[PDB]
């Protein structure tokens, strides 16, 4: 049960109990998008603008926006009145060299500075294979147990990000890892919506690799509709907490046709935390033809995007409100 | 102020509103002394014994005792049900290549884990310098900020011990450091003091090196009795928090005439988390005479040293219910 402090908070990020925010705390990954199209390394300025621009343009048509402290905070405060604000508290990626991927906060922040930058949410990244070494996950578990309880204390909704893979498989986009795909997501949403850990929003997979899904696939049919479904309704079976999907491995269009696939599958998911889809061709017109027509880019092919979406949404999200 | 909870913690870690707490979380410096003898390496049934010992023969003379969640468990659960328990929530040691001393929790441990594992308090080192690089500090006051904020949220009491120091100074009993003490120290208080780290106890150091104080120093002197009162005035000032004293590089008489001191002075703390003078001289017997020798050097000598001390604070430390 939410407190008055973290329900006023959830509704600024949400519309009718739905969440429609735009993802867009990418800090290494847009700077290597914007490195494919100029020559000279790209700036902190023009990553400060970029996210400006796209927070200016595109958040009319959001309920929130997520953001990262390190290159987000102007773009926070020209984001549309109407729209609420997330802030990032994960250092991005993870070390290459081993199989842990262990969880690390920003070092200079806390849920409480993140409060004090205005956000309406923590949101913190998690890499999970509930499959893995035990102690391993025995340190993430307790990492997570002290930013719930930071997130208690603040009084502010702590969005929860699960991203699943295995130890000793490499590509999360192989058959193999997609046969194993709904256990990882599944199980570790279980784990994560135990009350010790004091999640109010889990942003998560969809459970099933849609690309290896009978009538969605163009290659190899590892499941069937019914399979598919039913991984769908396993998800929503592990949790009673607020979750929402983000996308990943696929096409706007495949994601779009997933969330209705989701819907009529029995997933009463409730919003999306969505961006690269949306926002993605504005870097190479941003870096090459400048900000005006980055602007203009978002205004027509971003809004069209955004709106695409947000009609999807519309007739597939469900309301967190209960 | 504190909460009901906290209220009720803080009364169970101490007497009449005065802390004769234990400290014994003591880790690779305790197996260090266990060097007498050496037959092996230090089992981790021996350390956990003679912490068990010494927990089972001396805290019913003590308010509380601290314990490492690492070795103390055992000896925690055979504590005098007079006595309240502390445990320690931060990786001992610093790295001794670089001067930031950064802070960092026990892998597998959170506020909530400790309060789980009966604490009626969180105790976190941190070692700070108030002159050194800005950055540093940044990152050591966001990290007192979560615990501060876990604590919170689990309705624990923080105690927060500040150990000084200074990245130029490689001596921590020099003359040079001597003259800086009190500026470090009271400065140190006046930061952490401050309602956002959500410290409930200081643990902090005397605020001056009595080895170098007219009357009490055996050899140079750098500073007259009223320098040094004055150094303690100065403290009581730097904070409205409860704060309590710990014993670093002076015998257990010349601590115990500080304390006289200190009161003197006009000094209003709150007791001292001590005691490995009290039970100093079993380290040995432990593993000269066996188990047996050292609970009766405990029963007998460990009480004498213990009661001894109880008598000092009983006419120096003032309650902390202010
Ligand atoms: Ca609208
Ligand atoms: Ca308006
Ligand atoms: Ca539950
Ligand atoms: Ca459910
Ligand atoms: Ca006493």
Same mark, same amino acid.
């Given at each position: 049960?939410?407190?008055?402090?973290?329900?006023?908070?959830?509704?600024?990020?949400?519309?009718?109990?739905?969440?429609?925010?735009?993802? %867009?705390?990418?800090?290494?990954?847009? @700077? /290597?998008?914007? &490195?494919?199209?100029?020559?000279?390394?790209?700036?902190?300025?023009?990553?400060?603008?970029?996210?400006?621009?796209?927070?200016?343009?595109?958040?009319?048509?959001?309920?929130?926006?997520?953001?990262?402290?390190?290159?987000?905070?102007?773009?926070?405060?020209?984001?549309?009145?109407?729209?609420?604000?997330?802030?990032?508290?994960? +250092?991005?990626?993870?070390? &290459?060299?081993?199989?842990?991927? $262990?969880?690390?906060?920003?070092? #200079? !922040?806390?849920?409480?500075?993140?409060?004090?930058?205005? &956000?309406?949410?923590?949101?913190?990244?998690?890499?999970?294979?509930?499959?893995?070494?035990?102690?391993?996950?025995?340190? +993430? *578990?307790?990492?997570?147990?002290?930013?719930?309880?930071?997130?208690?204390?603040?009084?502010?909704?702590?969005?929860?990000?699960?991203?699943?893979?295995?130890?000793?498989?490499?590509?999360?986009?192989?058959?193999?890892?997609?046969?194993?795909?709904?256990? +990882?997501?599944?199980?570790?949403?279980?784990?994560?919506?135990?009350?010790?850990?004091?999640?109010?929003?889990?942003? #998560?997979?969809?459970? #099933?690799?849609? +690309?290896?899904?009978?009538? %969605?696939? =163009?290659?190899?049919?590892?499941?069937? @509709?019914?399979?598919?479904?039913? &991984?769908? /309704? =396993?998800?929503?079976?592990?949790?009673? $907490?607020?979750?929402?999907?983000?996308?990943?491995?696929?096409?706007? *269009?495949?994601?779009?046709?997933? $969330?209705?696939?989701?819907?009529?599958?029995?997933?009463? %998911?409730?919003?999306?935390?969505?961006?690269?889809?949306? !926002?993605?061709?504005?870097?190479? #017109?941003?870096?090459?033809?400048?900000?005006?027509?980055?602007?203009?880019?978002? /205004?027509?092919?971003?809004?069209?995007?955004? =709106?695409?979406?947000?009609?999807?949404?519309?007739?597939?999200?469900?309301? !967190?409100?209960?």
């Amino acid at each position: 049960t939410l407190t008055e402090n973290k329900r006023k908070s959830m509704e600024k990020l949400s519309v009718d109990g739905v969440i429609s925010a735009l993802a %867009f705390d990418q800090r290494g990954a847009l @700077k /290597r998008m914007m &490195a494919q199209h100029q020559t000279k390394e790209p700036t902190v300025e023009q990553i400060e603008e970029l996210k400006s621009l796209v927070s200016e343009e595109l958040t009319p048509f959001a309920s929130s926006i997520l953001l990262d402290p390190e290159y987000g905070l102007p773009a926070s405060r020209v984001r549309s009145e109407e729209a609420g604000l997330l802030l990032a508290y994960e +250092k991005t990626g993870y070390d &290459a060299t081993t199989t842990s991927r $262990l969880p690390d906060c920003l070092d #200079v !922040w806390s849920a409480k500075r993140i409060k004090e930058a205005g &956000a309406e949410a923590v949101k913190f990244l998690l890499y999970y294979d509930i499959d893995g070494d035990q102690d391993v996950n025995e340190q +993430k *578990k307790a990492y997570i147990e002290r930013i719930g309880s930071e997130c208690r204390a603040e009084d502010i909704p702590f969005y929860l990000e699960i991203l699943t893979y295995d130890e000793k498989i490499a590509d999360n986009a192989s058959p193999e890892f997609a046969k194993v795909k709904a256990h +990882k997501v599944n199980e570790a949403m279980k784990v994560f919506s135990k009350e010790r850990f004091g999640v109010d929003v889990l942003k #998560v997979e969809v459970p #099933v690799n849609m +690309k290896f899904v009978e009538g %969605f696939a =163009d290659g190899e049919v590892l499941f069937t @509709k019914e399979e598919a479904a039913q &991984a769908f /309704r =396993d998800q929503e079976a592990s949790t009673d $907490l607020p979750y929402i999907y983000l996308s990943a491995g696929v096409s706007a *269009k495949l994601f779009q046709d997933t $969330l209705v696939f989701a819907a009529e599958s029995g997933a009463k %998911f409730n919003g999306v935390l969505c961006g690269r889809a949306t !926002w993605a061709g504005s870097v190479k #017109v941003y870096i090459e033809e400048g900000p005006q027509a980055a602007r203009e880019w978002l /205004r027509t092919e971003g809004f069209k995007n955004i =709106d695409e979406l947000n009609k999807v949404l519309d007739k597939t999200a469900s309301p !967190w409100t209960e």
